[PDB]
UniProtKB/Swiss-Prot annotation, chains A, B:
Changing C105A: Abolishes enzymatic activity. Abolishes oxidation, association with mitochondria and protease activity. No effect on chaperone activity. Reduces binding to OTUD7B. Changing E17D: Strongly decreases enzymatic activity. One of its GO terms (biological process) is positive regulation of dopamine biosynthetic process. This is Parkinson disease protein 7. Changing M25I: In PARK7; does not affect protein stability and degradation; does not interfere with homodimerization; decreased detoxification activity on methylglyocal-adducted CoA. The record marks D148, G149 as: Cleavage. Induction: By hydrogen peroxide and UV irradiation. In pancreatic islets, expression increases under hyperglycemic conditions. Expression is also induced by sulforaphane, an isothiocyanate obtained from cruciferous vegetables. It comes from Homo sapiens. The modification Phosphotyrosine is found at Y66. Changing C105S: Loss of protein and nucleic acid deglycase activity. No effect on mitochondrial translocation. Reduced protease activity. No effect on protection against metal cytotoxicity. No effect on methylglyoxal-adducted glutathione or CoA. GO terms for molecular function: cadherin binding; copper ion binding; cupric ion binding; cuprous ion binding; cytokine binding; DNA-binding transcription factor binding; enzyme activator activity; enzyme binding. Its EC number is 3.1.2.-, 3.5.1.-, 3.5.1.124. The modification N6-acetyllysine is found at K147. A lipid is attached at C45, C52, C105 (S-palmitoyl cysteine).
């Protein structure tokens, strides 16, 4: 049976960090739902790319649970995720069921806001380190992708392919990740 | 004055190869227009990401000319570009005015269809080589980004950041490209 991913898409999300994981995960045969935080309407991303979600977050929740919940970055997008009670509930439930949570760039700071994954090793965009580290609840890493059990984090647009393939490996295994990687022409 | 880019977005385009150049070019202060080949309506990309264009191609043409015309890949998207009389006209006019044309993955095969840039060195996705090389009108390269004067080509999703930064360098210079690159966290 196919694995399933929930990608939560908020206004101000980094569109590269949204699309690269969605696309790579679909290449891996994962069933991905792009869920709009605010509803079903199109979402204006950080650099003004406009993406139409597959469903509202409200509706997508009803169709869970998911094998991974993915949080793109972009500061404003991450702040919207951090302020959402709906996201808090989704992430708490995911953590409670021992499911993977993956977050990139500023995205991990929503884990902090929602008190998710404390005691894990994490990375973030360099500029988001101090926010993420407020209180010392995580241990910081400068790895391009960090995985400490069920908390998977990464740094920026330029680590998005590595982030997405790490999610693929975690869900579908190393061989599928390698097969998906080769046609991408990564260095 | 700001440089301007036209990104032509067709059904079946590779969404990573669309969004990465749009986003990186906007980071560089280029004024980018995402133009829908088919009209103003949302565009279903190859891996089902749905992007709302800024304008129809018809309307965007009226607002030219552009410093660069960018052709994403995705086989079906590239075929739609190759079949469009509108695209033929845009690309012929761009070539006639000695403006940059940039194409990635299967995107360069639309240059072949429209008889653009013959006698240039080009690259493509490896799987698109034979299509691009039908007739021997170009010289093939395996460089991740190839630039032969005003024809700039690249290979795949995994070369999209290098492609976009090459466009930035060509329009705005090396220093701007370097400044835009650093916050991306590329390897």
């Amino acid at each position: 049976a196919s694995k399933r991913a929930l990608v939560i898409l908020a206004k101000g999300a980094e569109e590269m960090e949204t699309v690269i994981p969605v696309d790579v995960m679909r290449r891996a045969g994962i069933k991905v739902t792009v869920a709009g935080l605010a509803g079903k309407d199109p979402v204006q991303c950080s650099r003004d790319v406009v993406i139409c979600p597959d469903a509202s977050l409200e509706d997508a929740k009803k169709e869970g649970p998911y094998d991974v919940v993915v949080l793109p970055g972009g500061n404003l997008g991450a702040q919207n995720l951090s302020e959402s009670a709906a996201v808090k509930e989704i992430l708490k439930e995911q953590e409670n069921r021992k499911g993977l949570i993956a977050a990139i760039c500023a995205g991990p700071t929503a884990l902090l806001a929602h008190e998710i994954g404390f005691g894990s090793k994490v990375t973030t965009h360099p500029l988001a380190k101090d926010k993420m580290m407020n209180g010392g609840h995580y241990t910081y890493s400068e790895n391009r992708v960090e995985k400490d059990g069920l908390i998977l984090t990464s740094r920026g647009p330029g680590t998005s392919f590595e982030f997405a393939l790490a999610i693929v490996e975690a869900l579908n295994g190393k061989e599928v990740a390698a097969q998906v990687k080769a046609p991408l022409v990564l260095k």
